[PDB]
Write an enzyme that holds these catalytic residues in place. Sequence first.
Site, PDB file in Angstrom:
ATOM      1  N   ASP A 123      -1.647  -8.214  -2.219  1.00  0.00           N
ATOM      2  CA  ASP A 123      -1.960  -7.489  -0.977  1.00  0.00           C
ATOM      3  C   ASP A 123      -2.392  -6.015  -1.215  1.00  0.00           C
ATOM      4  O   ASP A 123      -1.741  -5.090  -0.684  1.00  0.00           O
ATOM      5  CB  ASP A 123      -0.685  -7.523  -0.066  1.00  0.00           C
ATOM      6  CG  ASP A 123      -0.094  -8.925   0.023  1.00  0.00           C
ATOM      7  OD1 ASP A 123      -0.863  -9.893   0.307  1.00  0.00           O
ATOM      8  OD2 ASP A 123       1.104  -9.114  -0.210  1.00  0.00           O
ATOM      9  N   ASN A 302       4.587 -10.868  14.461  1.00  0.00           N
ATOM     10  CA  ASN A 302       5.491 -10.634  13.368  1.00  0.00           C
ATOM     11  C   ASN A 302       5.078  -9.263  12.829  1.00  0.00           C
ATOM     12  O   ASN A 302       3.908  -9.085  12.417  1.00  0.00           O
ATOM     13  CB  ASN A 302       5.280 -11.743  12.329  1.00  0.00           C
ATOM     14  CG  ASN A 302       6.345 -11.744  11.235  1.00  0.00           C
ATOM     15  OD1 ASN A 302       7.443 -11.168  11.367  1.00  0.00           O
ATOM     16  ND2 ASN A 302       6.035 -12.432  10.158  1.00  0.00           N
ATOM     17  N   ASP A 305       2.233  -6.210   7.647  1.00  0.00           N
ATOM     18  CA  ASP A 305       0.797  -6.035   7.321  1.00  0.00           C
ATOM     19  C   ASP A 305       0.105  -4.900   8.121  1.00  0.00           C
ATOM     20  O   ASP A 305      -0.884  -5.163   8.825  1.00  0.00           O
ATOM     21  CB  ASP A 305       0.020  -7.334   7.618  1.00  0.00           C
ATOM     22  CG  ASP A 305       0.255  -8.446   6.570  1.00  0.00           C
ATOM     23  OD1 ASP A 305       1.038  -8.230   5.626  1.00  0.00           O
ATOM     24  OD2 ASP A 305      -0.307  -9.567   6.728  1.00  0.00           O
ATOM     25  N   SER A 322       0.858 -10.752  11.792  1.00  0.00           N
ATOM     26  CA  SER A 322       0.607 -11.882  10.894  1.00  0.00           C
ATOM     27  C   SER A 322       0.974 -13.191  11.636  1.00  0.00           C
ATOM     28  O   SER A 322       2.157 -13.364  12.010  1.00  0.00           O
ATOM     29  CB  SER A 322       1.474 -11.743   9.630  1.00  0.00           C
ATOM     30  OG  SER A 322       1.593 -12.995   8.926  1.00  0.00           O
ATOM     31  N   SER A 324       1.760 -15.841  14.346  1.00  0.00           N
ATOM     32  CA  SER A 324       2.535 -15.570  15.572  1.00  0.00           C
ATOM     33  C   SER A 324       1.656 -15.103  16.724  1.00  0.00           C
ATOM     34  O   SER A 324       0.588 -15.672  16.969  1.00  0.00           O
ATOM     35  CB  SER A 324       3.678 -14.594  15.244  1.00  0.00           C
ATOM     36  OG  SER A 324       4.649 -15.287  14.415  1.00  0.00           O
ATOM     37  N   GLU A 373      -3.799 -12.881   9.345  1.00  0.00           N
ATOM     38  CA  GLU A 373      -2.906 -11.782   8.993  1.00  0.00           C
ATOM     39  C   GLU A 373      -3.692 -10.720   8.246  1.00  0.00           C
ATOM     40  O   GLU A 373      -4.931 -10.852   8.108  1.00  0.00           O
ATOM     41  CB  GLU A 373      -1.701 -12.353   8.191  1.00  0.00           C
ATOM     42  CG  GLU A 373      -2.026 -12.770   6.758  1.00  0.00           C
ATOM     43  CD  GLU A 373      -0.822 -13.431   6.086  1.00  0.00           C
ATOM     44  OE1 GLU A 373       0.240 -13.565   6.757  1.00  0.00           O
ATOM     45  OE2 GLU A 373      -0.899 -13.778   4.886  1.00  0.00           O
ATOM     46  N   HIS A 472      -6.215 -10.863   1.899  1.00  0.00           N
ATOM     47  CA  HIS A 472      -5.419  -9.682   2.115  1.00  0.00           C
ATOM     48  C   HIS A 472      -6.089  -8.421   1.563  1.00  0.00           C
ATOM     49  O   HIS A 472      -5.568  -7.737   0.695  1.00  0.00           O
ATOM     50  CB  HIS A 472      -3.991  -9.852   1.570  1.00  0.00           C
ATOM     51  CG  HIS A 472      -3.036  -8.972   2.296  1.00  0.00           C
ATOM     52  ND1 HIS A 472      -1.916  -9.444   2.940  1.00  0.00           N
ATOM     53  CD2 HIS A 472      -3.121  -7.661   2.598  1.00  0.00           C
ATOM     54  CE1 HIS A 472      -1.294  -8.444   3.522  1.00  0.00           C
ATOM     55  NE2 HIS A 472      -2.040  -7.361   3.380  1.00  0.00           N
TER      56      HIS A 472
HETATM   57 NA    NA Z   1      -3.385  -4.657   4.628  1.00  0.00          NA
END
Ligand code: NA
Length: 635
Positions: A123, A302, A305, A322, A324, A373, A472
């Site tokens: 990430d 959630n 991120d 992310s 949800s 996400e 990501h």
């Molecule tokens: Na990011």
Amino acid sequence: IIHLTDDSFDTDVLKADGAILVDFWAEWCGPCKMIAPILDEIADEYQGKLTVAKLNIDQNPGTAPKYGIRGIPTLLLFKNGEVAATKVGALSKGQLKEFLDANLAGSGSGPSTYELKRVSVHDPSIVWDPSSKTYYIFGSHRAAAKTTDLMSWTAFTAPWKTATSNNAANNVAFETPAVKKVKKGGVDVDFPAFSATKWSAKGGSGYSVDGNMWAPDVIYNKVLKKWCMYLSINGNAWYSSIILLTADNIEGPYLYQGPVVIGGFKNGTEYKETDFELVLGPQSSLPERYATGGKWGDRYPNNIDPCVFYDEEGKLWMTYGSWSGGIWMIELDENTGLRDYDVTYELTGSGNGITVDPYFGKKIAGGYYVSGEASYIEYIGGYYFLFVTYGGLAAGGVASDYNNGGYQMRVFRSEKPDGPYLDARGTDAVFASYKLDFGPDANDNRGVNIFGAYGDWGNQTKGKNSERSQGHNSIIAAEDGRTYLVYHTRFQNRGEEHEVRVHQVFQNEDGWLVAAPFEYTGETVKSADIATSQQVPTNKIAGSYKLLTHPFKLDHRVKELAKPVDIELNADGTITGSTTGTWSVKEGTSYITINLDKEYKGVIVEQTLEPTSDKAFVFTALNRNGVTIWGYKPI
Ligand code: NA
């Protein structure tokens, strides 16, 4: 060795198959005689890939003045009867070999003048430190690395600071906010003594923060003059928060300032432990929209991120979320980096259709527990671009688990920092009901599919090193005038191993992003050159290309890869081979249009084929349906 004449030059050299090295020499030249035996040996050792020819210029006055030959001996390397490279003088064997290795294709990584030193930062969020002219990435699990060239990275760890340590443990670093009061209305109001790890522990039993420090974003706050790390502290059952830590120096140590946004407060009066009442005013009971039980993720985010950025008017914003209830956005205070408590969000929509919430802010993508996400926004060439990664992070290959694997990046854009974010055919990143948005059973394709999993491509992305689950990402329109997309990738046959990749990015004539099809290897072309110059002369375009299409719905369950097909671009603008179509360019620019079953608009530029020094002309283009194509021809 072929001893030429000036009449014999047109057939033997301009009508040659394979590279020809010509030695222009004369009798009254000591250095010509020094090099003669070296040329002998080179003719033996290079039999496979090169012909060596000599033109005595005393007999043959015609040839040399056409090529601007002056000092002798002059060595000319011809490629199909044009001059690929030139050298003058009595080179040593070693110098000649170095010269040939660098100018003949198929020599491998030896002659390359860059080095890719890999790091594993899951990430990765990229940021430029102008004080050291160094790029940094920060990732999950306290992974971090730095580079000055975007090719060779060096990993390090930034320490945490607390009141009593300059190198604090994870289990004490996020317990006590340094900030005690914030401004609202603008008088001081008590800010909660929020322990991020106690909060996330509410979601389960035996909680440990050690595997729950996820997906930081790091930005320099101009007013504070501090490096700010926005870090997710993850818990189960949506007990997650984004917190702010700050440091004088980008390498740390970082000191916890407090929470920016906190999630999961669905039960009883647990909201009283948060900043909920700072946002909404005192509340005697939890408003019923939040009392969702286990259905929280059909409605609300959630809280992980984060992406934090200044928009073009200097306003500071954060996006987060992310799966949800999707990706949400809130305004931050420019002078503290914490939430701007003076901003009011008016409740819009109801139930799972809520699109603006007084606490969580404005929804800009996702919803209804659809995948998506790692949101990220960057302003490039006149638009804000939003990236969302769909699908699962793992390598894939488990025929019975749809959520194992499938990671793939989608791009949307907007004229305003807070949306609405639309794709290339005008569809919103926000979902109006549940859809399966990725993979072979998807019933929705939206967003531009910048690229997906692929192999059999170039010298690096092939075999077990074919790349997949890329995502990501972060992206930076950098001070050097280039845009770099930075992401992690998994591979076709390396378990769950992951590494960081950096690709340059351009805009096509409609202003959409198109990624360079090879890793950034120090190309000099700048974003602004695309509209203002032609990188590849039109009469050099025609030839045999490998064409790769990045389609929606790859089956990650069996580790499907896109692989290229052979096509020919002909000088008359036709395409033949594996499919048929047409191509055309815009004189004086680097734009290209490729018409196959549909029209793709993109750019054509030179690239280096990592890890070698071999060059290619390469195109990268997009259709409004969000499908991209890439193509390359060796030069
Ligand atoms: Na990011």
